[PDB]
Amino acid sequence: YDRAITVFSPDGRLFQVEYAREAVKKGSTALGMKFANGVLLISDKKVRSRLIEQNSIEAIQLIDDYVAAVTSGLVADARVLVDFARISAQQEKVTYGSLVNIENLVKRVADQMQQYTQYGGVRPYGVSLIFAGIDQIGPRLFDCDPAGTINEYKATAIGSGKDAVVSFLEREYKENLPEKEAVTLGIKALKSSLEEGEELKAPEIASITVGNKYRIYDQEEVKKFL
Amino acid sequence: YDRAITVFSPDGRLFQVEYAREAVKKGSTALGMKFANGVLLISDKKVRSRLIEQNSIEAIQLIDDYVAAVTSGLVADARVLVDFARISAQQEKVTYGSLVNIENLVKRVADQMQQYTQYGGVRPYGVSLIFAGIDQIGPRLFDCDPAGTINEYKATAIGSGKDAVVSFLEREYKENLPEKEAVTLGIKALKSSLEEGEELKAPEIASITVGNKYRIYDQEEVKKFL
Amino acid sequence: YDRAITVFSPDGRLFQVEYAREAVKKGSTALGMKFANGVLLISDKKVRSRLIEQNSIEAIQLIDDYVAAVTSGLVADARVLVDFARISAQQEKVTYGSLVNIENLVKRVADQMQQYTQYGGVRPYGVSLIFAGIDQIGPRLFDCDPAGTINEYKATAIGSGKDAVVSFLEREYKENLPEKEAVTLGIKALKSSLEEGEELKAPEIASITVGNKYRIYDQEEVKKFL
Amino acid sequence: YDRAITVFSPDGRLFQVEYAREAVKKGSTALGMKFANGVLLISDKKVRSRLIEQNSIEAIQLIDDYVAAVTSGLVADARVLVDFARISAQQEKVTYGSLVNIENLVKRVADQMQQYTQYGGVRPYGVSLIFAGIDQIGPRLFDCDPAGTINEYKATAIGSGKDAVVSFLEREYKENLPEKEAVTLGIKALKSSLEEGEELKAPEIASITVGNKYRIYDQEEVKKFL
Amino acid sequence: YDRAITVFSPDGRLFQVEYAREAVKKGSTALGMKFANGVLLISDKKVRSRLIEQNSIEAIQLIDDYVAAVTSGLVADARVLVDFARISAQQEKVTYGSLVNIENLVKRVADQMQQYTQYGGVRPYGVSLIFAGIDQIGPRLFDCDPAGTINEYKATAIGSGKDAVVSFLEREYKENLPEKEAVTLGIKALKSSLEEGEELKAPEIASITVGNKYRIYDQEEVKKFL
Amino acid sequence: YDRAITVFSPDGRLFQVEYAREAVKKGSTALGMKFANGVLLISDKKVRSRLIEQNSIEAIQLIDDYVAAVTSGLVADARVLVDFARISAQQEKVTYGSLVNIENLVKRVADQMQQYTQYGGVRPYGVSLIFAGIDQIGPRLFDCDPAGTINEYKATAIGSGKDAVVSFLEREYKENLPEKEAVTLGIKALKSSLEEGEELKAPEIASITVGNKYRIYDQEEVKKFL
Amino acid sequence: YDRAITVFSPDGRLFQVEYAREAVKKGSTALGMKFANGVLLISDKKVRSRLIEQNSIEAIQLIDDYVAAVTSGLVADARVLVDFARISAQQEKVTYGSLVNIENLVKRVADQMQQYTQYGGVRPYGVSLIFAGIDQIGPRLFDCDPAGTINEYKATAIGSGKDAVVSFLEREYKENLPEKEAVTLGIKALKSSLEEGEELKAPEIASITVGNKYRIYDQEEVKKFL
Amino acid sequence: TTTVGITLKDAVIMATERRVTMENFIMHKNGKKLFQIDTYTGMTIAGLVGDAQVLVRYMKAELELYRLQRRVNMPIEAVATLLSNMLNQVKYMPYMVQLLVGGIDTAPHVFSIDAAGGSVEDIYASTGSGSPFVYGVLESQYSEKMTVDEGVDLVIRAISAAKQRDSASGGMIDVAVITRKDGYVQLPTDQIESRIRKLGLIL
Amino acid sequence: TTTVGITLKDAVIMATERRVTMENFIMHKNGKKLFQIDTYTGMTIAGLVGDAQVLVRYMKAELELYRLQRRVNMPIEAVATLLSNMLNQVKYMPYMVQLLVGGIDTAPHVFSIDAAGGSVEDIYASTGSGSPFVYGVLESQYSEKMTVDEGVDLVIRAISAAKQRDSASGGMIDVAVITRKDGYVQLPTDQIESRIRKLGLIL
């Protein structure tokens, strides 16, 4: 109908960018939340076969030593967009000397997604991401949308368990929270949704507290909170 | 019908630019009005969930210390267009030394929107904005349209409550008005429309008086006028 | 049918450029006429709401101190094309030292419109303009057409009241005429057409006499001729 | 059918270039003929309203002091193509010092028309022209076609009265002819066709005799031959 | 079907290049043949009206003093392609000092036609040509095809009387032949086909013998062989 | 439906990239596995006719002396993509001095495939590859997908016998394994699938152990394990 | 269906590249085979009319003094692709000093064909070629496919008699063979297929033995083996 | 360096010396300055070594592509015109080389092309540092009525005088006579030693 | 600096010294100027250090890409022609380097390429500041009938004379004999010390 390249609807809809949002609804679930002095990111990692090199596939990826990202949607678009975010953070390190705002970093990536929402001859990025980290302002937690829409959260989700996890977070989130109870609350969120295949697995989870660099857990530590 | 890229109608209509106007009718309401020696901008901000970082999402955004903007429509197109307006104001600061006309600034942004109204291979900007601020001429209040149409007002609206708010302003607006009664009239306008979900919330609202720089209210001050 | 980008008809028509002409038939009416030693331009200005900043919206716009223009059609295309005419007049001031022919100025703008009549990937300019002013040759009054067609008149119209006004001018125009009786004849023309909503309003009207610069009336002077 | 951009037919037709030829059949009639030591061009000029500035609209336009052109078809495409012919003649004056062949000049313009006959993304030039003037070879009279086809004549026509005028010329043309009887024969040709609205008007008509420059008649002289 | 830009068929056909070949079947007939020490080219020239400047329209056109060409098909594409062949021969004169092979010259022109057979966004050249002349190798006679196919002949045809003439040549051609009997055989070929409108006319015909330059006949000489 | 260039679905599918995955399902089967201190790649090679130069067609192709690749899908796209991988490995040798990560090499090739998944005017690469080799990290075994999706394995397959081989590997793979029993397990995998035409043939198979360069078997050695 | 520019199928097919393969099935047959110390290429040449300059049309064309090519399919695409192969061999002579691998030469030409298999806005090359010659490695015989697929043979065919000739070669080919019995076997292959019009003709045939340059037979020598 | 090219009745004889310097410092006692550029024409080298070898590679390339496409050898005026166009399309980043192409197409030719691309026929030509010595002996001893053997003896005497009187010239002379009947043939070094020992130019 | 490359019967021997300056001021007493450029050929370095290392990286790159694509080693005339084309495509922003590539494909070769891209074979070649000393001893002592051991002893005596008589040359000599049977092998430093102590060139 030319409802198949990014142009407007009979009533106010971009059908392709919608269709990208249902592409990111078909992905793997992941979430994140702020705690008392930092922010976490937990992805579900559902290592399906035993032949997959469990730990070496990573969906929580680092953009800097002071911004991380976990993604959901088409995984190839995800990898390309995360690499754009990495080189953009490096551009801001070369230009200004430091990454003073993480909001600038999510805004440049989201402008990149708005362009392929705007122009024809190309489809939108069918991928959604959440960014987390501390800057001069403090702990920040963002979200990104196939249109390039950004919103800032105290806690958010993405993926197949978007809505179920966001309902649990909408009920049971407490703003200032020690790190241990925070990752416990996050795992309970990931559980309640993903325990419909009656299994969770060991998830992957990273954290920062303001002042320190990045710490991604190992295989042994996450099973204590599991 | 190729009624899906910006070309003309069987009778004098640009169907895509229409479809962008019904896209900006689906947005969040916002309005603005001049008062005795300045101009205000009030956005509704309807912070839906409790996980949204209430004050850090801002729809009244500054283009300069002497021009501000509140937007409505697709929020990604909004952010990209507002950043274009910011760098255009900075171009005029580099070239001429000061921002002597705010009408020049709305006209350049509106030419930017007319281009993507004009050319194929790309959709229009599905976003509408109002610009407010003082220049050498004095207080000015503009509007912007998905075609790039600009009109100058003493008071205008945008968003889902376009028509209801514009009806209240059409009846009850007084031209020269002290700032307090002006923001009270603006909140009554925002109320009468948005009190159909039987709630308003604390809105966000900024003001200038001619001579001073920009002042965006805090959370506590707006509830006194609420 | 590919009757939706500018290509030829089964019999000799450009359907898109037609569709642009019915877009300029949907506009606001405006007209102009030569008098004994100059030329006038009167636009209807129908200030609909009371919130519109009546005098600050101007549809008679200056291209030079010695060429003016009033436009009709899509107002965004109008503003972009008028700005092109302004910078083209300034190019001729840089290159030749003065604007010796106003016909050169209307021809460059009309070539600009012919291009977007000619090429695909873009729609025509859905706008019509009349140019007026004196040059070395004397008083000239032109017209412009969505195809880029120019014609020179002693008096012409444009807009919703194209045909009614042109019928009145076809009957009652006198070639050499003092300025006062000229603006009276122009207002009678604007009346007879636009008095179908049983109102006219104060119109906007400018004039030149050969030798002097530009004079746009104020609000008080036009009501004496009204 | 994609029979609406310039590609080939089920049997050997360029449908768009046809459609341009029926666009030039809808134009105003014009003709030309050689006489004993030169060539003439007569356009019908049917000044419809009294508000048109009768003499200042000219369809016989000069390309040089030693080549002229009268056009028929879409008048905007006509003006753009005539300006191309003018600057091409000026290119040959800069490069070679003089315009030694007028056939080179019609061939460059016709190559320009063949390109937009050849490429997609753009329509043909819906315009036809005849070129006339003397060169080193002598008096020449050409024709041009929306495909870029050129043919050389002793006498030819163009416009709405193509066929009727060409029938009269096919019967009653004499090769070597004094200028007065030549313009009389041309007016009889223009009459027999255009006297179906039972009026002709004063036409516009120019002539050269080999050795002299260009002479376009005035209003008074043509009515003696009328 | 996208059988309207040059792409492949359900079985091995280029429909547009076919449609160009039926466009060159609709043209004017022309032929050529080698004789004992050279080669001739005879075009039919059917001067239809008496107003056409009989001798000045030429379809046998010179590419060099040592290569000539007669063309058939769309006459505008013909003129553009012949001018390409002329400037290519001049390029080889600049680069190598002489036109040592005429096969190189037909191959470059045929590569030019293959490109517009290959690419989209443009139609093929709907024109066919035969090239004739002597080089270092000797007398050569080529043919060209809307795909860019070249074949070398001792005698060939092109145009509306392709098949009838090629049948007569297939029966009655003798390889080594004096020039007079050669042009007589060529005229008999042109006759047998074109004498279906029960007329031939004076044709146009050129010849070279190896060692000499180019000789195009005059009006009087061809009627002796007619 | 424009479900024939890479844009999104009514529900979250890229139909063209799917269609490329069923294109790589139609290919020849190939697999690979890590062993105790290295990794192997075995392709089926089914030399169909006797006229094919059996050993000179190679589907296990070297990208470096320390990365190899076996491919499946469209063989032309395969060869072009493998050559891109070769010159990319050489770029990293020029820039950094050595190929320190093989994951970087698969990621650049996969970004190359994501681009033609992303843009219109071009189809995706209808090819899948597995990369194998040691780097500073150790033995790695990757896979590549027509979208550009990469996954890391201990053992994987590709081709017509994707699913049957992956089922056998899912049951019977042991992680640390001497090279001889590893190639025996790989041949049993290739057998169980490809023994549906009741034949296997001699396959082609290469191996590395960490520290050494590349060794592709000869014809005699593989038949001992067959 | 957009199954008329090169994009993927509902199941794993490139319909345009198929359609190019049935275009090369409609061509003239040609074949080649290795012998004891070299390789031959025999084309059928079926000189249809007597007016074709029998020996001067050549389908076995030289790419170097040490690589030759015979082609089948669309003959214009053939000539353009063979000229690309010639200038590519010359590039390798300028760059490396000699043509050390003929496989590099077929791979570059095949990459050229893969590009127009890959991109839209253009059709594939509807042509197939076989390359033959000796390099440092020895005698090589390749094939090329409208997708760009290459395969190496000891003997292969192309054209209308693809399958019949390949069946005869599949039965009766002997690997090491003296040149005389090799060209006899090749002619028997060409016979068995092409003797369905109950005629063969004199074919054209070339050979190399390793160490010597190129030898294309004359008309008299091939009839001894006929 | 010194090169020579002599046109006689039905043959054209070209020879160079073989010594490359590349420094002051004669570095290579056996270079290659005489190149077979097509089946019936050759080229000598008397300029900068790298630029000259790139010119030889390009001319071998274009003349072989020529013979392959058109199936006839390129004329000598055509190859020297092509070489002039190449040397004159880039003259403000020029090739510092003095070229001398010679061959036979229907008549024996030798042309001389400078670094700016000026080609001009002469019956005998020479390029190089030791050029005026071979022009002296060719001016004093050359005859257009010579045979091929008298011509190649004149060539060897010329290059021998240039080696005796010039520092940059030296090494073993390689001579190649190109005629229409036998094609481009280069004389073996034992035959050239035999001609030197016959003419009495060895010490 | 000084490099040397000697072709004998079925082997080609190349060696450099190891001293980098980079200033006047000899800065690095152990450099690397002899590089294995493919499995049967190597390259020496006697110019500007940075430009030379970039040339070595590009030639390792193109020859490994070559061996991977075509599965055969590149000939020595082919690698030196490629190197000449690279050095001559940019000569007005040139690489100030003197190269010397040597290896074996069907016969042992060593070529010498200057900064302008002029490649020319010789039976022995040398580049560097200490080049004329090793050309003196190679001119006085070289024989084409040598064995590999006599050749590497000649090479060590050459570079030793250049170290004794030249300031920019010095450091421990690294020598690598490339033959067809054993491939590119580089002699260990203890063996080179043993040859120096045997020949009596230590003090």
UniProtKB/Swiss-Prot annotation, chains A, B, C, D, E, F, G:
Supply the alphabetized keyword list.
Cytoplasm, Proteasome
Q: Does the keyword Chloroplast apply?
A: no
What's the short name of a Pfam family annotated to this entry? Answer: Proteasome_A_N
Consequence of substituting residue 75 to A? No effect on PAN's ability to stimulate gate opening
Query: Which branch of life, at top level?
Result: Archaea
Q: How is it modified after translation?
A: The N-terminus is blocked.
Q: Please summarize the record's notes on activators and inhibitors of this protein.
A: The formation of the proteasomal ATPase PAN-20S proteasome complex, via the docking of the C-termini of PAN into the intersubunit pockets in the alpha-rings, triggers opening of the gate for substrate entry. Interconversion between the open-gate and close-gate conformations leads to a dynamic regulation of the 20S proteasome proteolysis activity.
Q: Where would you find this protein in the cell?
A: Cytoplasm
Which GO terms fall under biological process for this protein?
proteasomal protein catabolic process; ubiquitin-dependent protein catabolic process
Q: Which family is annotated?
A: Belongs to the peptidase T1A family.
Q: Misc remark for this entry?
A: The configuration of the closed gate contains an opening large enough to allow rapid entry of tetrapeptides but able to impede the entry of proteins and longer peptides.
Stored NCBIfam families? arc_protsome_A (TIGR03633), PRK03996.1 (NF003075)
> How does this protein assemble?
The 20S proteasome core is composed of 14 alpha and 14 beta subunits that assemble into four stacked heptameric rings, resulting in a barrel-shaped structure. The two inner rings, each composed of seven catalytic beta subunits, are sandwiched by two outer rings, each composed of seven alpha subunits. The catalytic chamber with the active sites is on the inside of the barrel. Has a gated structure, the ends of the cylinder being occluded by the N-termini of the alpha-subunits. Is capped at one or both ends by the proteasome regulatory ATPase, PAN.
The protein here is known as Proteasome subunit alpha
* Species annotation: Thermoplasma acidophilum (strain ATCC 25905 / DSM 1728 / JCM 9062 / NBRC 15155 / AMRC-C165)
Taxonomic lineage is:
Archaea, Methanobacteriati, Thermoplasmatota, Thermoplasmata, Thermoplasmatales
UniProt gene name:
psmA
From Swiss-Prot, chains H, I:
Offer an example of a GO molecular function term for this protein: endopeptidase activity
- Give the chief site where it resides: cytoplasm
Q: Where in the cell is it found?
A: Cytoplasm
Q: Does the keyword Transferase apply?
A: no
Q: Which UniProt keywords apply?
A: Autocatalytic cleavage, Cytoplasm, Hydrolase, Protease, Proteasome, Threonine protease, Zymogen
User: Domain of life of the organism in this record?
Assistant: Archaea
List the EC numbers from the record.
Answer: 3.4.25.1
The reply on keyword Protease is: yes
Q: InterPro entries from the xrefs?
A: Ntn_hydrolases_N, Pept_T1A_Psome_bsu_arc, Pept_T1A_subB, Proteasome_bsu_CS, Proteasome_sua/b, Proteasome_suB-type
User: How is this protein activated or inhibited?
Assistant: The formation of the proteasomal ATPase PAN-20S proteasome complex, via the docking of the C-termini of PAN into the intersubunit pockets in the alpha-rings, triggers opening of the gate for substrate entry. Interconversion between the open-gate and close-gate conformations leads to a dynamic regulation of the 20S proteasome proteolysis activity.
> Which residues are named in the active-site annotation?
1
What is the annotated signal peptide range for this record? none
The biological process GO terms on file are: proteasomal protein catabolic process
Q: What else is known?
A: The configuration of the closed gate contains an opening large enough to allow rapid entry of tetrapeptides but able to impede the entry of proteins and longer peptides.
Q: Which family does it belong to?
A: Belongs to the peptidase T1B family.
The record describes its quaternary structure and partners as: The 20S proteasome core is composed of 14 alpha and 14 beta subunits that assemble into four stacked heptameric rings, resulting in a barrel-shaped structure. The two inner rings, each composed of seven catalytic beta subunits, are sandwiched by two outer rings, each composed of seven alpha subunits. The catalytic chamber with the active sites is on the inside of the barrel. Has a gated structure, the ends of the cylinder being occluded by the N-termini of the alpha-subunits. Is capped at one or both ends by the proteasome regulatory ATPase, PAN.
**What job does the chain carry out?**
Component of the proteasome core, a large protease complex with broad specificity involved in protein degradation. The T.acidophilum proteasome is able to cleave oligopeptides after Tyr, Leu, Phe, and to a lesser extent after Glu and Arg. Thus, displays chymotrypsin-like activity and low level of caspase-like and trypsin-like activities.
The name on file for this protein is Proteasome subunit beta
Q: Which gene encodes it?
A: psmB
